[PDB]
Amino acid sequence: EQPQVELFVKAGSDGAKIGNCPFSQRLFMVLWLKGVTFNVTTVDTKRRTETVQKLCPGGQLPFLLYGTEVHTDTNKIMEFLEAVLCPPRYPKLAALNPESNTAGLDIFAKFSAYIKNSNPALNDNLEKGLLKALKVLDNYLTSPLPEEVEGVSQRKFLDGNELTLADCNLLPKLHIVQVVCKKYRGFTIPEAFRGVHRYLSNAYAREEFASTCPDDEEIELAYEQVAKALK
Known part of the structure; x- marks a missing residue:
């Protein structure tokens, strides 16, 4: 049974669209390639939701919610994802x-x-x-x-x-x-x-x-x- 996967990413200039951030894209891409069911939520860093503030106090972006576990650091997030979403169910992308x-x-x-x-x-x-x-x-x-x-x-x-x-x-x-x-x-x-x-x-x-x-x-x-x- 797949734990919920939700990636929080940088919003752009209207606070809603994809913002410039190659780290957010990198991770959206990894998740897409893995074939896992996930969500992607954009964050306006001047106007954060209450959920985001509670999930990730540090304010870092991107971050990932995996079940009820939060992960920061794009590289570490990438590592985590490569390890936990693995074969047989999901492909190794390394x-x-x-x-x-x-x-x-x-x-x-x-x-x-x-x-x-x-x-x-x-x-x-x-x-x-x-x-x-x-x-x-x-x-x-x-x-x-x-x-x-x-x-x-x-x-x-x-x-x-x-x-x-x-x-x-x-x-x-x-x-x-x-x-x-x-x-x-x-x-x-x-x-x-x-x-x-x-x-x-x-x-x-x-x-x-x-x-x-x-x-x-x-x-x-x-x-x-x-x-x-x-x-």
């Missing part, structure tokens, strides 16, 4: 190859530096840094994993042809990178990074990812005071 768990994880810090910088003399250095991080990801994607034995992998995702926890982490981060770089830097992931573009097409084709993305407009609004014009 990657087979440990480097799937790290591939592309530096892109986000590179992106953050790029968009926060206002020193024009430093802008091309930061762009190059983000580009090199994307290219290390493009290389991981196009390199055949063991389970595949031209030399260009055609697997759909980071670890193989199925979505794993690893994609649930990276895909929400890459999404923000795309939307915010287009809007504030006029920067686009070069078409020549074909592994990265095949991955994203595959990902946007899957509802687990598409359906759990905040709107562009919300991501853009979230970065409005943080993205700096060069001066």
Whole structure:
């Protein structure tokens, strides 16, 4: 008998819609992939419900209610979920190859530096840094994993042809990178990074990812005071 599973996530600008938060998306995605029956409740952090205040006094977001147990810390929540929702009833989502768990994880810090910088003399250095991080990801994607034995992998995702926890982490981060770089830097992931573009097409084709993305407009609004014009 499945204990009740309810994920509390960041609300967006109207207090109700999906807010910008790659951690909330990461977990919505894990739960979707597990096949478990769950609920998702958005939280307006300036206008919290009484239930939320009692469930999670610390105020952290996302958090999970599992039966009457609360869990904070996205990574720990992810671990918990991978362990308790397990086969036979639910699929193991962990990657087979440990480097799937790290591939592309530096892109986000590179992106953050790029968009926060206002020193024009430093802008091309930061762009190059983000580009090199994307290219290390493009290389991981196009390199055949063991389970595949031209030399260009055609697997759909980071670890193989199925979505794993690893994609649930990276895909929400890459999404923000795309939307915010287009809007504030006029920067686009070069078409020549074909592994990265095949991955994203595959990902946007899957509802687990598409359906759990905040709107562009919300991501853009979230970065409005943080993205700096060069001066």
